[PDB]
Design an enzyme around this catalytic site. Structure first.
Site, PDB file in Angstrom:
ATOM      1  N   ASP A   1       0.490  -0.815  -0.078  1.00 46.23           N
ATOM      2  CA  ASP A   1       0.078   0.073   0.147  1.00 46.23           C
ATOM      3  C   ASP A   1       0.703   1.631   0.107  1.00 46.23           C
ATOM      4  O   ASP A   1       1.781   1.192   0.116  1.00 46.23           O
ATOM      5  CB  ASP A   1      -1.100  -0.235   1.322  1.00 46.23           C
ATOM      6  CG  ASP A   1      -2.089   1.526   1.021  1.00 46.23           C
ATOM      7  OD1 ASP A   1      -3.010   1.215   0.346  1.00 46.23           O
ATOM      8  OD2 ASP A   1      -1.896   2.599   1.988  1.00 46.23           O
TER       9      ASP A   1
ATOM     10  N   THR B   1      -4.015   4.768  -2.970  1.00 41.09           N
ATOM     11  CA  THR B   1      -3.165   5.744  -2.431  1.00 41.09           C
ATOM     12  C   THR B   1      -2.141   6.146  -3.141  1.00 41.09           C
ATOM     13  O   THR B   1      -1.443   7.035  -3.764  1.00 41.09           O
ATOM     14  CB  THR B   1      -2.047   5.662  -0.786  1.00 41.09           C
ATOM     15  OG1 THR B   1      -2.169   3.775  -1.044  1.00 41.09           O
ATOM     16  CG2 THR B   1      -3.110   5.586   0.435  1.00 41.09           C
ATOM     17  N   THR B   2      -1.702   4.805  -3.685  1.00 43.51           N
ATOM     18  CA  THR B   2      -0.081   5.336  -5.254  1.00 43.51           C
ATOM     19  C   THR B   2      -1.016   6.013  -6.123  1.00 43.51           C
ATOM     20  O   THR B   2      -0.417   5.801  -6.611  1.00 43.51           O
ATOM     21  CB  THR B   2      -0.279   3.504  -5.459  1.00 43.51           C
ATOM     22  OG1 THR B   2      -0.326   2.454  -3.889  1.00 43.51           O
ATOM     23  CG2 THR B   2       0.663   2.998  -6.041  1.00 43.51           C
TER      24      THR B   2
ATOM     25  N   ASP C   1      -8.623  -1.699   4.442  1.00 36.86           N
ATOM     26  CA  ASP C   1      -8.425  -1.554   2.859  1.00 36.86           C
ATOM     27  C   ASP C   1      -9.713  -2.187   2.310  1.00 36.86           C
ATOM     28  O   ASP C   1     -11.126  -1.486   1.565  1.00 36.86           O
ATOM     29  CB  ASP C   1      -7.515  -1.756   2.163  1.00 36.86           C
ATOM     30  CG  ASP C   1      -6.561  -0.915   2.382  1.00 36.86           C
ATOM     31  OD1 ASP C   1      -6.215  -0.056   2.456  1.00 36.86           O
ATOM     32  OD2 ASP C   1      -5.216  -1.310   2.134  1.00 36.86           O
TER      33      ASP C   1
HETATM   34  N1  LIG Z   1      -7.297  -7.927 -11.975  1.00 29.39           N
HETATM   35  C1  LIG Z   1      -7.407  -6.622 -12.387  1.00 29.39           C
HETATM   36  N2  LIG Z   1      -7.565  -6.186 -13.655  1.00 29.39           N
HETATM   37  C2  LIG Z   1      -7.618  -4.736 -14.422  1.00 29.39           C
HETATM   38  N3  LIG Z   1      -7.669  -3.407 -12.659  1.00 29.39           N
HETATM   39  C3  LIG Z   1      -7.162  -3.705 -11.890  1.00 29.39           C
HETATM   40  C4  LIG Z   1      -6.828  -4.916 -10.889  1.00 29.39           C
HETATM   41  N4  LIG Z   1      -6.496  -5.250  -9.892  1.00 29.39           N
HETATM   42  C5  LIG Z   1      -6.933  -3.875  -9.722  1.00 29.39           C
HETATM   43  N5  LIG Z   1      -6.828  -3.192 -10.739  1.00 29.39           N
HETATM   44  C6  LIG Z   1      -6.832  -1.585 -11.149  1.00 29.39           C
HETATM   45  O1  LIG Z   1      -5.945  -1.369 -10.271  1.00 29.39           O
HETATM   46  C7  LIG Z   1      -6.185  -0.581  -8.839  1.00 29.39           C
HETATM   47  C8  LIG Z   1      -5.475  -0.833  -7.613  1.00 29.39           C
HETATM   48  O2  LIG Z   1      -6.184  -0.026  -6.653  1.00 29.39           O
HETATM   49  P1  LIG Z   1      -5.295  -0.234  -5.177  1.00 29.39           P
HETATM   50  O3  LIG Z   1      -4.827  -1.392  -5.309  1.00 29.39           O
HETATM   51  O4  LIG Z   1      -7.153  -0.236  -3.651  1.00 29.39           O
HETATM   52  O5  LIG Z   1      -4.738   1.071  -4.616  1.00 29.39           O
HETATM   53  P2  LIG Z   1      -3.975   1.617  -5.581  1.00 29.39           P
HETATM   54  O6  LIG Z   1      -4.741   2.212  -6.559  1.00 29.39           O
HETATM   55  O7  LIG Z   1      -3.077   3.107  -5.289  1.00 29.39           O
HETATM   56  O8  LIG Z   1      -2.735   0.767  -5.630  1.00 29.39           O
HETATM   57  C9  LIG Z   1      -8.003   0.160  -8.914  1.00 29.39           C
HETATM   58  O9  LIG Z   1      -8.606   1.056  -9.317  1.00 29.39           O
HETATM   59  C10 LIG Z   1      -8.088  -0.969 -10.556  1.00 29.39           C
HETATM   60  O10 LIG Z   1      -8.696  -0.257 -11.159  1.00 29.39           O
HETATM   61 MG   LIG Z   2      -5.800   0.155  -2.794  1.00 29.55          MG
END
Ligand SMILES: Nc1ncnc2c1ncn2[C@@H]1O[C@H](COP(=O)(O)OP(=O)(O)O)[C@@H](O)[C@H]1O
Ligand SMILES: [Mg+2]
Ligand SMILES: Nc1ncnc2c1ncn2[C@@H]1O[C@H](COP(=O)(O)OP(=O)(O)O)[C@@H](O)[C@H]1O
Ligand SMILES: Nc1ncnc2c1ncn2[C@@H]1O[C@H](COP(=O)(O)OP(=O)(O)O)[C@@H](O)[C@H]1O
Ligand SMILES: [Mg+2]
Ligand SMILES: [Mg+2]
Lengths: 538, 191, 520, 50, 548
Positions: free
Chosen positions: C56, C89-90, C386
């Site tokens: 995170d 957050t990222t 989260d």
């Molecule tokens: N399997 C997946 N396929 C497509 N998009 C994904 C997948 N997993 C995550 N994402 C995208 O990556 C983003 C990751 O969000 P999250 O990990 O909750 O926080 P951060 O964006 O800060 O890393 C999400 O908004 C999502 O749209």
């Molecule tokens: Mg996240």
């Protein structure tokens, strides 16, 4: 890029961090794997103060020796959680994490991503649970047979000390859980057994005592050590006042009031002790061969020892907190703090109470109970390190036999589950794949990493691991076609396969559960780690 | 290294009971018996507790013999005050003696008029504070301009007692270390 | 004759901005690979020695002390994003870096003023919230089956996607317990308790509505299993309270000293008799308990537990409905808690644990997480934070938007159409905002291992047809619509990202001089 | 398997502990007493010196 | 936890060695390292460019507007920046023109490549993109060429050549600086019209001698050469016409001593008496054969003895010191003499022709002049450059070297082949290269597109250095090329360019009437070597250093 933020920072990324994680795991594996099995070597933890201690458990080796590498700290913390909840199998955790990172890194160098590799471990982990629940066997513990508990205890205690001491100590482990049992509530406490550290004849001259043994002796010589029938009485308030909470002082008007105000403190001592003397003769007056002992947690006034000494009353002080629960379980009494209400019903009973003068101290022995729900184990030894060695042996052996009663299922040992699980994780046809040509790389890596446990036992015994496993492989090839369920093991005496159920080697169900679960999680997260960083303010 | 020492060193007998459920009994009760013995020594040493309004013949005994104490070098600190009622700083220093006397019962607090102390003493040099210990003068202090002068407070006087070796630095009775209960209450909530 | 104790020399002009923008790019480079489902993990070595394994954004930035002051404005954005929402957050850091990286060759090349760029970002932010409102849509909030896939969206990046079936039920029951009726969802994370238990198995878990205490009973005679417990909270110690007035007693007669200790016993006797006026069965106190008071409570069966924290007493109050009362005289039957059950103390060799369960709409619970190490317990615990953080916004507002680079691409396509239509001096930095939203889709593609030049080229033509729900898959890298898979996030995460990214760029773009040596 | 580059051997006695075997030490002890003896040699007798 | 393992297996190499891979944004840092000194070049291109102070560790200062010159003294750590130093050094040695361009273009190709690598373009495709752009760039430079010189010697044509070259380095006044070069170029060239001979020109022919004092307007063009020498015997104005003769000797004017142990030997008094007079009569007898040929000045190559000097100034023969090899060779080209090391009679065909040798006060010190006349012209002429500050003499002297280097560009190729200057040649390639990107398919089109964007730095730099807002001056100039070639012939929109001083809007009143142009040979190798500078920096993905 990190140097622009903090010049004093460092970073290893995507090739140097992977070598650090694998080399630190293999370096931790190469040092700590030698303790696995009965033929393992003994380590001497010599600190700066000169304290010597012998042990083979990976928990206490890593606890005393601080870990400098960041990867091995994560593995030491896994061994802590393993030893905490279970108390056995720490050497299997570090070997599985070391082998999983070794077998995984063999494929990462071939150009495979770490994500699908860890995906195969989880599918292989879930596949092992579907193999483990079918591989276990159910037994009836209601009979309370001694032969099964002895051979199960012998399997755990052989990995700590040699054979002649194991045969003497293996009845002590089976005698620990005789009366501690509840069928309906299913409550079984491990802390009720009391481990006393003392120097005596030898480690091989220990013995089991049914009742409780305290480390406090009689202060006055006049009180009798031998008591044929004792009624215990639990005290918690201090007969010797330490300090008055409200500040006060005796301002006497004349010299005649000095001894009277000194007698005012005598009245409050005689006030609470008069009920103790009345409690004695309430049962029966002029009854020979019937004593009356008092166990107090807080201190006792030396001025009051003369009152206890005249009536032949055994008084002990500075007892432990957890012993107050152990008194009522052994003697069958009832705990009390004050002395306002007293009766003969609350008093316990004891068939024999005696003391022995060993060195500059005296130990109180209370035995011959009617239906005691607890016991104790005297850890006698010829030195300081044998006490800690036998203490770790009992504390590791109590959990192996206690898990048999917590859950009736038990897995055969001698590497039987690791050998049998290797074939089952070879070819996952259409059960759980998830993708084509991706998950199967991790299935192969997980299957090959589990077979390091029986090979490590053979390396300690001094035979070839591939030769003794070849006949094990040839045995199970015909066992499936012979229409007969057969479990094979690894005998380290002659270097030949064997039968665990026949010979007597077993493993607890919760050891393999937390070991495979903890090792797979740490092995997965360390593969996912692609960069190590440090930052802070000195 | 200090994290293990803060469990025992930074907790009194009242604060050590917080770790009864968390820490081991033998580790905790072994130190509580040690701290309990130290508390008993201070009670036996509490031979004082109010300002000894003395006179000269007696000075040759109260101020100096006391400073020897048991003479086990049981030394005793003796703070003398050459009082002068006409000066404003003298009445301030007299209030600090009675306030400190109620707290530090082991230290002797001595007061005497300055006109009766020394033959023809300079009135400008009063109030004077002398500190005896084992018959030797540890500090011959001059008027309180060093300690703020007219604006002298109880916190400044307690800090001076630590410099001469009369009270330990980490003593729980000093106002610098004796944090308020409301202060510690906010720390636990924000932790 | 220095004239200045604090940096008489100065680094002014454009070189200070190169150090600022390059430092803003460096903080994004160390977490560029921490996005998408195939994201890697990081390790941090704090000086205290407590390691942590994190992916995170907020946990990475807060444990890294940075000497560059201009970079520290970027370090605090995840702190702002964490306390506001707790998810996404990222994306705020890399988006703020791309805005600063894309806006770099305009003062160097075009020599356009910063204040003109400040006006350009606000109009882009105004249009960014407009098109996000158009792309978003509402859904039903009470459908438990729909809430599972939304919680699964943020979980897919973390390690616990393999147990996503268990984690969704673990978090959905917890957030619904603390939820109540009255901003229509005033529940707070502070009421939710999460106790980390080393050992066990993560598959075996359950949402118990109670307060898990980490201590044993004080006396061995007490029964550890109560069918119909009665909770009573107290702040007064059962010990004798010492008066702060420092009262001294002049003892002249002989019977005075004996009467004082008898009054001490009589006070504890009278004090314990008032506890039994409402005949409780379970008592809780945040202070010590004397051994004298333990004996008198044995006849009533009042189980006592001592040295309980102040926050845990409030959590015990909301579950059982008991009122915290200091003095022992004001105990009434209404003060005694009710509708409690299943009081049992499970024996574990590490520490003693006591459970609670129910049968003033505020409620609380305790999620008992089982694992293999204390560090991964913090990982699963932060995933729980989260897991409920993404669930609050869908409950607060019914609005909802897609994700996975699709919502960011929709901002770039709409801005690019009107960027040529503006035809003014501000259109040059206005195009940088449209190009700044391309890092997120790009980052996702790069981590997945695909070729971003051709995957994004056809994605431009795909969104030109007039669709918005088309994203990029993280595993294989298709241009398939996210309606089939079910990648959906709340609207509040993307709103806070573009707002915090624009507001952070306005702070850092208006810096031209760097000084130090103040020592305030 | 080893923890580091090299492993220096342990001295059995503590560092700085003086010890010696053979007939040299008992001769040194006797010569030490004779050295103290020579101080009191001329003191013996009525005509001796302080 | 307290300390990392600090990069294990690091003892494979020394502790001072460090690796620098393409990852971790290090290629972006190398572009930023170029950006540090590239911005220094922004304020040094053009006629409004600003010179630079460079204080060496020895203290020798050189103030200058030229890249290749400034980069010699600066000690550089980054190897990728040293590619630009040696790339500009190659530009100065071969052509001697267009060094800032090598620096400003190749730095901007790395700037626009920062966007391309960030998008995800592979490094192999980036080199293929600029190479395909380079083949089209060099092709179109030959197509859009207008004008030619067609005459080696002309008063008005040289004003079109020298003036746009020296306008960058020390602009000042145009006429007083351009006439000094155009007058000196005509002296040294072998004209020889209607003969069919191959032309020839040497960079070392025209050389500038720095003399302090005076002003830039008092500078004159000397036919011959000059040194800061002093005649030994006597000074002579030489008011006698009927031109003198010149004899050049490379050996010293003294008795040829034996190389192996030249020592006297006198056995008796008869040899002692004649040995003193024998040296006098021997040296005198050698001067008789030299003096009868009518020579009145002899240039010596090394130290001259006193006895030989006594007989030279007897007949009024001037003595000149040239104690070096190149200083003696340059003087023979003026008079056209063939030296011989022997001390005998010079051959009459080998004797040189110099009419007068004057000695006057210019800089306060003694100088000797060798001005020829219109009859019997000579080559390797010099230019007396007067100025107040010695630092300004150094930069103006190298401007003559750049102007003399531009005259070399006419000899080798078929002709002049001038191009329109003032950004017109750069802005025209932007439209042609942009159209070329639309004709070619594939993922290389973005590389072709960014190659055109990199050429905007010349008009953007001249607009920034001229004190004008580039946001208004640049797109106003694009309107002249967005109205592309209609059906009418003889379109005059190609001569539109930027303007440093004057009218608003900026499209210059043609570069025409202004008489400013650029050379084709400079643009060919400049774009070639600039692309090689960007090719070698972008093609490498890992860098290894030592000791720092
Ligand atoms: N399997 C997946 N396929 C497509 N998009 C994904 C997948 N997993 C995550 N994402 C995208 O990556 C983003 C990751 O969000 P999250 O990990 O909750 O926080 P951060 O964006 O800060 O890393 C999400 O908004 C999502 O749209
Ligand atoms: Mg996240
Ligand atoms: N007598 C034996 N023969 C063969 N294998 C054994 C024997 N005793 C123990 N093992 C094997 O050693 C493994 C670990 O046992 P043990 O050494 O008691 O735990 P730890 O390695 O944590 O000390 C078990 O999985 C078991 O298969
Ligand atoms: N007075 C002027 N008006 C318009 N353009 C000019 C003027 N003087 C110079 N330029 C342009 O500026 C450019 C500067 O070229 P530069 O690289 O400095 O030449 P050099 O190689 O001699 O340094 C020339 O190509 C020319 O077209
Ligand atoms: Mg074991
Ligand atoms: Mg030029």
């Amino acid at each position: 890029s990190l140097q622009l933020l903090n010049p004093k920072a460092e970073s290893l990324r995507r090739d140097a961090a992977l070598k650090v994680n694998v080399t630190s795991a293999e370096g931790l594996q190469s040092v700590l794997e030698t303790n696995l099995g009965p033929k393992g070597t003994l380590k001497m933890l010599v600190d700066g103060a000169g304290n010597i201690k012998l042990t083979k458990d990976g928990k206490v080796l890593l606890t005393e020796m601080q870990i400098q590498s960041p990867t091995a700290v994560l593995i030491a913390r896994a061994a802590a959680a393993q030893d905490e909840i279970t108390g056995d199998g720490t050497t299997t955790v570090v070997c599985l994490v070391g082998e999983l990172l070794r077998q995984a890194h063999r494929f990462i160098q071939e150009g495979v991503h770490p994500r699908i590799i860890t995906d195969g471990f989880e599918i292989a982990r879930k596949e092992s649970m579907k193999f483990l629940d079918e591989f276990k066997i159910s037994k009836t513990n209601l009979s309370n047979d001694r032969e099964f508990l002895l051979q199960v205890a012998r399997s755990s205690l052989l990995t700590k000390v040699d054979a002649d001491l194991t045969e003497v100590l293996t009845p002590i482990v089976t005698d620990a859980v005789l009366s501690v049992y509840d069928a309906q509530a299913d409550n079984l406490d491990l802390h009720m057994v009391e481990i006393m550290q003392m120097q005596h004849l030898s480690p091989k001259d220990t013995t089991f005592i049914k009742g409780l043994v305290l480390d406090h002796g009689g202060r006055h010589p006049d009180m009798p050590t031998r008591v044929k029938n004792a009624y215990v009485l639990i005290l918690n308030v201090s007969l010797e006042y330490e300090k008055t909470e409200v500040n006060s002082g005796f301002f006497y008007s004349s010299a005649d009031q000095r001894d009277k105000l000194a007698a005012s403190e005598r009245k409050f001592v005689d006030a609470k002790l008069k009920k103790i003397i009345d409690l004695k003769n309430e049962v029966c007056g002029m009854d020979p061969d019937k004593g009356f002992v008092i166990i107090n947690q807080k201190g006792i006034d030396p001025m009051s020892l003369d009152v206890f000494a005249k009536h032949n009353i055994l008084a002990l002080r500075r007892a432990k907190r957890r012993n107050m629960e152990r008194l009522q379980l052994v003697t069958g009494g009832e705990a009390q703090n004050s002395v306002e209400d007293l009766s003969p019903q609350i008093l316990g009973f004891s068939g024999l109470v005696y003391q022995e003068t060993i060195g500059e101290e005296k130990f109180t022995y209370v035995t011959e109970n009617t239906d005691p729900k607890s016991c104790t184990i005297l850890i006698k030894g010829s030195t300081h390190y044998a006490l800690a060695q036998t203490k770790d042996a009992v504390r590791d052996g109590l959990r192996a036999v206690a898990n048999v009663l917590k859950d009736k299922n038990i897995i055969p040992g001698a590497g039987a589950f690791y050998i049998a699980l290797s074939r089952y994780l070879r070819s996952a046809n259409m059960n759980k794949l998830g993708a084509k040509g991706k998950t199967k790389t991790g299935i192969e890596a997980f299957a090959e990493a589990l077979l390091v446990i029986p090979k490590t036992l053979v390396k300690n015994s001094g035979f070839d691991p591939l030769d003794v496993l070849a006949m094990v492989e040839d045995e199970l090839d015909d066992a499936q076609d012979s229409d007969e369920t057969r479990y094979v093991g690894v005998d380290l005496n002659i270097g030949d396969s064997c039968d665990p159920t026949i010979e007597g080697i077993w493993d607890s169900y919760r050891v393999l559960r937390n070991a495979i679960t903890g090792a797979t999680g740490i092995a997965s997260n360390l593969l996912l780690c692609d960069e190590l960083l440090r930052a802070g303010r000195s | 290294a200090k994290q293990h020492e803060n469990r025992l060193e930074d907790k009194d007998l009242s604060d050590l009971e917080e770790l009864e459920d968390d820490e081991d009994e033998d580790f905790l009760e072994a130190y509580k018996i040690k701290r309990l013995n130290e508390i008993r020594k201070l009670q036996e040493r509490s031979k004082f507790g109010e300002v000894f309004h003395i006179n000269k013949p007696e000075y040759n005994k109260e101020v100096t013999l006391a400073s020897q104490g048991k003479k086990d070098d049981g030394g005793v600190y003796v703070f003398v005050h050459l009082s002068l009622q006409s000066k404003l700083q003298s009445r301030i220093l007299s209030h600090l003696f009675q306030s400190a006397a109620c707290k530090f019962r082991e230290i002797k607090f001595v007061e005497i008029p300055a006109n009766r102390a020394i033959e023809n003493y300079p009135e400008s040099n009063c109030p004077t504070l002398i500190v005896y210990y084992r018959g030797e003068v540890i500090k011959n202090m001059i008027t309180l301009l060093e300690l703020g002068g007219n604006n002298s407070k109880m916190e400044d006087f307690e800090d001076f007692m630590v410099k001469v070796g009369a009270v330990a630095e980490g003593d729980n009775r000093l106002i610098m270390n004796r944090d308020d209960e409301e202060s510690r209450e906010e720390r636990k909530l924000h932790y | 004759v220095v004239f200045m104790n604090a940096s008489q020399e100065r680094t002014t002009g454009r070189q200070a901005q190169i150090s600022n923008i390059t430092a803003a790019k460096a903080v994004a480079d160390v977490i560029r690979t921490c996005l998408g489902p195939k994201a890697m993990l990081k390790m941090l070595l704090d000086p205290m020695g407590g390691l942590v394994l994190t992916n995170d954004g907020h946990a990475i930035l807060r444990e890294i002390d940075v000497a560059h002051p201009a970079a520290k404005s970027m370090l605090e954005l995840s702190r702002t994003q964490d306390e506001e929402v707790g998810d996404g957050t990222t994306t705020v850091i890399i988006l703020a870096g791309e805005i600063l990286a894309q806006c770099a060759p305009y003062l160097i090349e075009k020599n356009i003023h910063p204040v003109i760029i400040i006006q350009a970002l606000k109009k882009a932010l105004t249009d960014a919230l407009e098109v996000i409102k158009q792309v978003s849509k509402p859904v039903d909030v009470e459908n438990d089956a729909a809430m599972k896939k939304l919680i699964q969206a943020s979980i897919g990046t973390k390690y616990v996607i393999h147990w996503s079936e268990k984690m969704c039920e673990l978090a959905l029951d917890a957030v619904k317990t603390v939820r109540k009726d009255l901003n229509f969802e005033i529940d707070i994370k502070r009421y939710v308790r999460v106790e980390k238990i080393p050992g066990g198995d993560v598959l075996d878990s359950r949402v118990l509505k109670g307060v898990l205490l980490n201590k044993d009973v004080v006396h061995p005679k007490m029964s550890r299993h109560i069918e119909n417990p009665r909770v009573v909270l107290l702040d007064c110690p059962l010990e004798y309270k010492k008066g702060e007035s420092q009262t001294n007693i002049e003892i002249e007669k002989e019977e005075d000293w004996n009467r004082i200790l008898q009054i001490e016993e009589e006070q504890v006797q009278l004090m314990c008799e008032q506890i039994l006026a409402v005949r409780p069965t379970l008592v809780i106190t945040e202070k010590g308990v004397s051994d004298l008071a333990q004996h008198y409570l044995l006849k009533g069966g009042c189980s006592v537990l001592r040295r309980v924290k102040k926050s845990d007493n409030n959590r015990i109050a909301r579950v059982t409905g008991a009122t915290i009362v200091n003095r022992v005289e004001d105990l009434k039957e209404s003060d005694v808690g009710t509708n409690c059950g299943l009081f049992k103390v499970e024996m574990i060799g590490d520490e003693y644990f006591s459970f609670l369960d129910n049968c003033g709409l505020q409620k609380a619970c305790t999620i008992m997480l089982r694992g293999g190490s204390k560090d991964i317990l913090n990982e699963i615990d932060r995933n729980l934070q989260d897991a409920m953080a993404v669930a609050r916004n869908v409950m607060l507002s019914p609005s909802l938007s897609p994700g996975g680079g699709a919502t960011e691409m929709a901002v770039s396509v709409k801005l690019a159409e009107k960027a040529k239509q503006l035809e003014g001096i501000q259109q040059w930095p206005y195009q940088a905002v449209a190009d700044a939203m391309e890092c997120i889709p790009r980052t996702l593609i790069q981590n997945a291992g695909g070729d971003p030049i051709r995957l994004l080229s056809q994605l431009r033509a795909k969104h030109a047809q007039g669709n918005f729900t088309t994203g990029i898959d993280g595993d294989k890298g298709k241009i398939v619509d996210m309606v089939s898979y079910g990648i959906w996030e709340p609207e509040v995460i993307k709103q806070q990202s573009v707002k915090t990214a624009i507001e952070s760029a306005c702070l850092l773009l208006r810096v031209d001089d760097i000084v130090s040596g103040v020592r305030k | 398997m080893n923890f580091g580059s090299q492993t220096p051997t342990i001295v059995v006695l503590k560092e700085g502990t003086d010890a010696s075997q053979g007939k040299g030490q008992i001769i040194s002890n006797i010569n030490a007493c004779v050295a103290v003896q020579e101080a009191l040699k001329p003191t013996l007798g009525p005509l001796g010196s302080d | 936890s307290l300390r990392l393992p600090q990069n294990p297996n690091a003892g494979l190499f020394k502790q001072g060695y460090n690796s620098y891979s393409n990852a971790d944004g290090q290629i972006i840092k190398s572009i930023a390292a170029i950006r540090e000194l590239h911005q220094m070049c922004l304020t040094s291109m053009g006629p409004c460019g600003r010179n630079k102070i460079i204080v060496n560790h020895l203290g020798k200062i050189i103030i200058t507007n030229d890249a290749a010159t400034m980069l010699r003294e600066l000690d550089i750590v980054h190897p990728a920046v040293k590619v630009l130093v040696m790339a500009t050094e190659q530009q100065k040695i071969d052509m001697g023109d267009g060094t800032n361009l090598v620096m400003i273009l190749a730095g901007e190709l790395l700037n626009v490549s920062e966007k391309l690598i960030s998008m995800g373009l592979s490094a192999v495709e980036i080199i293929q993109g600029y190479n395909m752009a380079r083949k089209f760039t060099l092709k179109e430079l030959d197509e859009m060429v207008v004008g030619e010189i067609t005459d080696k010697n002309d008063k008005n044509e040289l004003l079109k050549m020298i003036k746009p070259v020296i306008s960058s380095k020390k602009y000042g006044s145009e006429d007083i600086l351009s006439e000094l070069v155009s007058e000196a170029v005509s002296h040294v060239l072998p004209v020889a019209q209607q003969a069919g001979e191959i032309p020839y020109f040497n960079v070392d022919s025209i050389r500038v001698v720095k003399i302090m004092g005076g002003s830039l307007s008092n500078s004159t063009v000397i036919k011959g050469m000059v040194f800061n020498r002093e005649p030994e015997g006597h000074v002579k104005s030489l008011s006698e016409d009927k031109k003198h003769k010149v004899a050049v000797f490379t050996c010293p004017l003294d008795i040829a001593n034996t190389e192996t142990k030249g020592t006297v030997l006198l056995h008796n008094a008869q040899e002692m008496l004649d040995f003193s007079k024998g040296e006098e009569k021997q040296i005198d007898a050698m001067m008789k054969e030299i003096a009868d040929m009518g020579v009145e000045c002899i240039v010596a190559g090394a130290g001259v003895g006193e006895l030989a000097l006594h007989y030279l100034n007897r007949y009024g023969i001037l003595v000149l010191k040239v104690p070096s090899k190149f200083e003696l060779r340059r003087l023979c080209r003026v008079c056209g003499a063939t030296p011989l090391p022997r001390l005998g009679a010079p051959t009459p065909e080998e004797l040189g022709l110099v009419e007068t040798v004057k000695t006057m006060e210019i800089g306060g010190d003694r100088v000797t002049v060798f001005k020829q006349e219109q009859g019997e012209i000579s080559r390797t002429s010099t230019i007396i450059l007067r100025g107040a500050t010695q630092n300004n003499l150094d930069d103006i002297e190298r401007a003559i070297d750049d102007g003399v280097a531009a005259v070399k560009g006419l000899m080798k190729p078929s002709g002049g082949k001038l191009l329109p200057g003032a950004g017109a040649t750069e802005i025209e390639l932007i439209s042609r290269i942009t159209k070329y990107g639309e004709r070619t398919p594939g993922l290389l089109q973005l590389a072709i597109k960014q190659f055109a964007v990199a050429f905007e730095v010349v008009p953007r730099t001249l607009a920034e250095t001229a004190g004008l807002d580039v946001n208004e001056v640049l797109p106003n100039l694009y309107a002249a090329h967005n109205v592309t070639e209609p059906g009418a012939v003889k379109t005059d929109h190609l001569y539109k360019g930027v303007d440093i001083d004057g009218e608003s809007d900026e499209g210059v009143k043609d570069i025409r009437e202004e008489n400013i142009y650029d050379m084709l040979a400079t643009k060919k190798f400049a774009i070639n070597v600039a692309t090689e500078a960007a090719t070698t920096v972008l093609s490498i993905d890992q860098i290894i250093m030592a000791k720092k």
